[PDB]
């Protein structure tokens, strides 16, 4: 009959990502062109670029220019590939992301934003450039000063 238990065993394409996380650009360059799945979600919940060790932007371009997931992220904490770049202090990565339609405007669920996580940790060079590439205060240019005084209306 049909066996079943729970933990399934299906190692789909996941090389292009594994190599990246290992700061190995050579294995990815030869793989991305060898037919590496450009949109292969890895079991690390860190996309194909979010898990490129964030220490070798050269890898990001490889997947990004090929079609990685510089936008999609995690459905548990919204960890976009934008936090990976700043969180590691690698601006070269963010540049690539923005070089191929990057969603520099999401929020790590409770992390507020990647530009803020970059400033708190120690990626000022990225935190600053991030606020310029991710923009902010958009859709609220009225008081610009925390919850102003008075109950604001929110018709939805």
UniProtKB/Swiss-Prot annotation:
ANK repeats lie at residues 11-40, 44-72, 77-106, 110-139. SUPFAM superfamilies: Ankyrin repeat (SSF48403). Changing residue 60 to V: In melanoma; loss of CDK4 binding. Transmembrane segments: none annotated. The keyword Acyltransferase does not apply. Changing residue 83 to Y: In a pancreas tumor; also found in head and neck tumor. Changing residue 80 to L: In a head and neck tumor. Changing residue 77 to P: In CMM2; loss of CDK4 binding. Changing residue 126 to D: In CMM2; impairs the function. Keywords: Acetylation, ANK repeat, Cell cycle, Cytoplasm, Disease variant, Li-Fraumeni syndrome, Nucleus, Phosphoprotein, Repeat, Tumor suppressor. GO terms for molecular function: cyclin-dependent protein serine/threonine kinase inhibitor activity; NF-kappaB binding; protein kinase binding; RNA binding. Changing residue 114 to L: In non-small cell lung carcinoma. Changing residue 100 to L: In CMM2; requires 2 nucleotide substitutions. Changing residue 134 to V: In non-small cell lung carcinoma. It is found in: Cytoplasm; Nucleus. The modification Phosphoserine is found at residues 7-8, 140, 152. It is linked to The association between cutaneous and uveal melanomas in some families suggests that mutations in CDKN2A may account for a proportion of uveal melanomas. However, CDKN2A mutations are rarely found in uveal melanoma patients. Acts as a negative regulator of the proliferation of normal cells by interacting strongly with CDK4 and CDK6. This inhibits their ability to interact with cyclins D and to phosphorylate the retinoblastoma protein. This is Cyclin-dependent kinase inhibitor 2A. It comes from Homo sapiens. The gene is CDKN2A.
């Amino acid at each position: 009959m049909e066996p079943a238990a729970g933990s399934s065993m299906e190692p789909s394409a996941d090389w292009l990502a594994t190599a990246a996380a290992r700061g190995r650009v050579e294995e990815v360059r030869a793989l991305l062109e060898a037919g590496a799945l450009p949109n292969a979600p890895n079991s690390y919940g860190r996309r194909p670029i979010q898990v490129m060790m964030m220490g070798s932007a050269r890898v990001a371009e490889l997947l990004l220019l090929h079609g990685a997931e510089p936008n999609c992220a995690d459905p548990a904490t919204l960890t976009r590939p934008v936090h990976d770049a700043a969180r590691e202090g690698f601006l070269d990565t963010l540049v690539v992301l923005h070089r191929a339609g990057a969603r520099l405007d999401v929020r790590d669920a409770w992390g507020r934003l990647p530009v803020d996580l970059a400033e708190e940790l120690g990626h000022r060079d990225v935190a600053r450039y991030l606020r310029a590439a991710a923009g902010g205060t958009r859709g609220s240019n009225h008081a610009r000063i925390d919850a102003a005084e008075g109950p604001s209306d929110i018709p939805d």
